């Protein structure tokens, strides 16, 4: 019920409770709920806040950092292959060098 | 009720309380509420929030080397494919030799 009994509600209630006794209580005792602005949140809050979003995206920044190097590892794989042609190129050499 | 319920109030509270046996508030039992300056933050906190602060900049600022390791990742598989250049140089080169 604390959804139900929200901020609001509390105010008249603590008045009634006065009212029966002490009644202006809009003056010395109480602040009408027209001027009770929320309060802005704190700095501290707000870094906290800020550096929790830093700690995620070190996360998401490991994890694209820890995929990436995957790529470089077929690419090097490829390479490998790639040189292939090196040792089949070496075929050509030896018997070229026979000519002679 | 704690928006309405902030520092006027309870201190016009606890002063309608007090007249009643003790009427002398403001002077001496307590001080007016128009010289009430807020406190200045203590250095503790100060520091704090600005501790957070740098923490939280280096989740933001851990991320970028799982994206700038994978940009010199992408560039040497670049300058891997770039070296098949050479390769192909030394079949020119190898046949060059043949032509002589």
Do not use: C, W
């Not at 090097?76 to 040189?83: A, D, L, S």
């Amino acid at each position: 019920l604390a959804p139900l009994f929200g901020l609001e509600q509390d105010r008249y209630m603590t008045a009634q409770i006065f009212e029966l006794m002490g009644i202006k209580d809009t003056h010395k005792y109480l602040l009408p709920l027209e001027q009770y602005q929320p309060p802005e949140p704190s700095p501290m809050e707000i870094l906290q806040l800020e550096m929790t979003k830093a700690q995620v995206e070190n996360v998401q920044a490991s994890s694209q950092k820890m995929i990436a190097d995957a790529f470089d590892q077929r690419e090097r794989t490829t390479f490998e292959q790639q040189k292939a042609a090196d040792e089949l190129s070496l075929r050509q050499e030896e018997l070229q060098f026979k000519q002679e």
